[PDB]
């Protein structure tokens, strides 16, 4: 059949006159996402993800009303198989190479600070706190899942190192201060380029969003762009205290295991192998 042909009735309604076979489908974990020129249509795979999709729509509405200094995917249409249509954020990721220009780095660091500040401020808002996930002991849950699912795939020395990293996690205070994207890698931050210096267009892939600890997003930024750049962001934003540094480092050190854990569950052996490097 094919996903485009399969969902053609809805697509003709949502995208009138648009040739379905000219569209792209991004194969998400929970959602099949059809990509059109200015918007996407999120389709659930499981009955689980179909059930959650109303709340996802509510979450995206809230995000669309925050002051983050940039765009987010705005809900344009929801209904029923449930569907959610989101605005498509323009722009492309910034390759790390661009940050070798120090004046680019300054401007990019500044816009990250605005974004992170906006997210931080938003966590104080009770309206936001009502609509967004705010789980407790997410890290001790993670640790138990690593031990259960990953430790059997690991060497003795691997298991020893991981146990050290999972120990550090219990040292972390369960902070729920900020809106936390949860997966704020380079690919999820889009820029306008070739019009002077890069301007932050918007942020995408809010599936992991929650009220939590901002150190998670800062760790993600450092993972994508390196220590120097993160340091630049931390200084500009006044987040360069030891206390923050510890949380960032603790969280950062879980990133390979997180990748292994999710690659384990969804039977992606390339990601699992890469994630388990040094642990076996």
């Amino acid at each position: 059949m094919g996903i485009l042909q399969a969902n053609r009735v809805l697509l003709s309604r949502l995208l009138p006159g648009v040739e379905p076979e000219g569209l792209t489908v991004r194969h998400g974990q929970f959602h099949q996402v059809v990509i059109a020129s200015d918007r996407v249509v999120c389709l659930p795979r499981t009955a689980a993800a179909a059930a959650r999709l109303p709340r996802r729509a509510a979450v995206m509405r809230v995000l669309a009303g925050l002051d983050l200094g940039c765009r987010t995917p705005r809900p344009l249409c929801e209904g029923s198989l449930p569907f959610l249509v989101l605005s498509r954020v323009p722009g492309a990721p910034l390759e790390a190479d661009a940050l070798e220009d120090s004046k680019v780095a300054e401007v990019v660091a500044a816009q990250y600070v605005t974004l992170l500040s906006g997210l931080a401020s938003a966590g104080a808002d009770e309206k936001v706190r009502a609509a967004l996930p705010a789980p407790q002991g997410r890290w001790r849950q993670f640790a138990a899942d690593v031990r259960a699912e990953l430790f059997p795939l690991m060497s003795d020395g691997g298991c020893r190192q991981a146990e050290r990293e999972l120990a550090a996690l219990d040292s972390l205070p369960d902070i729920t201060e900020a809106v936390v994207h949860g997966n704020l890698g380079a690919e999820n931050v889009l820029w306008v380029r070739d019009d002077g210096l890069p301007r932050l267009s918007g942020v995408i892939d809010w599936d992991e969003v929650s009220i939590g600890d901002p150190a998670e997003d800062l760790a993600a930024i450092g993972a994508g762009y390196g220590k120097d750049f993160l340091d630049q962001v931390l200084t500009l934003g006044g987040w360069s205290d030891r206390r923050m540094a510890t949380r960032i480092a603790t969280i950062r050190a879980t990133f390979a295991l997180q990748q292994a854990l999710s690659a384990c569950r969804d039977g992606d052996e390339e990601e699992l192998a890469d994630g388990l490097t040094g642990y076996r």
């Binding site: 997966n183 890698g185 599936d207 998670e216 760790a219 993600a220 993972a223 997180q258 990748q259």
Partner: peptide, 6 residues
């Protein structure tokens, strides 16, 4: 829910 190392 850091994916591919973030």
């Amino acid at each position: 829910k850091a994916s591919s190392x973030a």
